[PDB]
């Protein structure tokens, strides 16, 4: 389309000279709750939907956590076209992050590099918000267009458990799935919670509070790993995943690696880089990840998604959802629509009747 080429070429690079990164997203944040948005063009086709986590998708390409930390844009979101949204991570108190400058484009990769630190308003703002619109989030829901809620914890936590706990507890009856996020690269000692023994107690705690939940306000729960998981990490994962029946991964957060060739000045920040330097080790760890869970884990794959291409690789990888953020800083809105209709027009050309049949066809071949 002509908006595609519009914001590509023009909109966004002259946003992007004119504000710093972290302004620039305060304020897209703000237009999109006001659904200051260009034409919802595209009509999701029945081939893009897709049934998962006790919920019907109208389509399999979500907003990923950090774009809307706060639940300030859900429906603008929805309007943008997103088969589902997630918003976070929240933090059980809120808490200002890291200091600025905190987020840094590298254009010429395609990349983003961030170390904000898990900025939040915390639980109880984040709750109301959400109490709020929480019944046309129901009929959303019916209609195919769930909500996510991803779960941090507190810079100053001493038990790390009890705060995704609480979490639980608060968020939980607001969402459709919860994310236990234990792979921020920003937050010390966090990744460590992906260890085995760390996990499973995690995990098991977690589950708990979920279980406790009423019925109708019991969300699946997710746990979101980290891009630079070692063989043995994985495999780990993979065995409290099976032995204590969690609902799902999202695979990947931000790497802290920095792979050979980036060229952006920044490239030597600190921070989780996103983008396209991660999109095939994403795409990677999500087989790696669908292998070790026999295909029966539910995997929502996230990492460099700015094509129908990229997302339907991470799809025959394993995945049966994706999200994507930071295709958003370079190319803007009609990304969204452009990643569905060429998603669609792939599905076709390989021979799937829909997005259900090619999850995981990587792996049949
Ligand atoms: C600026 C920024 C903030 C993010 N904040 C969060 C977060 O709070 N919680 C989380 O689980 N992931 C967060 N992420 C990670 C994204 O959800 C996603 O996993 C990652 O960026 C890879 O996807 P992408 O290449 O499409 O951006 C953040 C990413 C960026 C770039
Ligand atoms: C201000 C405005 N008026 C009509 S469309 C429009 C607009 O393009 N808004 C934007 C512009 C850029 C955006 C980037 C990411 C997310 C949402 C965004 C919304
Ligand atoms: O808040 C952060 O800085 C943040 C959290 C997270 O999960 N991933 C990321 O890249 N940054």
């Keep these: 389309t002509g908006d595609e080429r519009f914001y590509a070429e023009h909109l966004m690079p002259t946003l992007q000279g004119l504000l710093d990164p972290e302004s620039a997203h305060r304020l897209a944040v703000r237009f999109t709750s006001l659904g200051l948005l260009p034409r919802a063009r595209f009509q999701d086709s029945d081939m893009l939907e897709v049934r998962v986590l006790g919920h019907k998708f109208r389509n399999p390409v979500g907003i990923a956590a950090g774009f809307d930390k706060h639940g300030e844009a859900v429906d603008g979101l929805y309007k943008m076209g997103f088969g589902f949204v997630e918003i976070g991570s929240v933090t059980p108190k809120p808490q200002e992050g890291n200091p600025r400058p905190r987020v840094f484009r590298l254009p010429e990769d395609q990349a983003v ?149 980036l060229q952006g000045a920044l490239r030597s920040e600190t921070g989780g880089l996103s983008g396209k330097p991660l999109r095939d080790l994403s795409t990677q760890t999500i087989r790696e990840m669908y292998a070790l869970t026999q295909g029966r884990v539910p995997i929502i794959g996230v990492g460099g998604v700015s094509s129908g291409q990229d997302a339907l690789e991470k799809i025959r990888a394993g995945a049966s959802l994706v999200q994507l953020y930071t295709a958003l800083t370079f190319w803007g809105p009609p990304v969204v629509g452009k990643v569905k209709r060429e998603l669609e027009a792939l599905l076709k050309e390989q021979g799937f009747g829909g997005v259900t049949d090619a999850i995981g066809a990587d792996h049949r071949r």
């Design 113 to 261: 590099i961030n170390r904000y630190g898990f900025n939040s308003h915390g639980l109880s703002v984040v709750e109301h918000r959400l109490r709020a619109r929480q019944q046309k989030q129901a009929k959303l829901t019916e209609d195919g267009l769930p909500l996510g809620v991803n779960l941090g914890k507190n810079k100053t936590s001493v038990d790390a458990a009890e705060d995704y706990a609480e979490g639980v507890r608060v968020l939980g009856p607001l969402a459709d799935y919860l994310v236990v996020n234990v792979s921020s690269p920003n937050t010390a000692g966090l990744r460590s919670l992906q260890g085995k023994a760390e996990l499973r107690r995690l995990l098991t705690k977690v589950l708990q509070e979920r279980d406790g939940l009423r019925r109708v306000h019991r969300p699946a729960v997710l746990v979101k790993i980290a891009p630079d998981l070692t063989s043995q990490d994985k495999e780990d994962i993979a065995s409290v995943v099976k032995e204590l029946g969690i609902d799902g991964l999202i695979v990947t957060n931000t790497t802290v690696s920095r792979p050979a060739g």
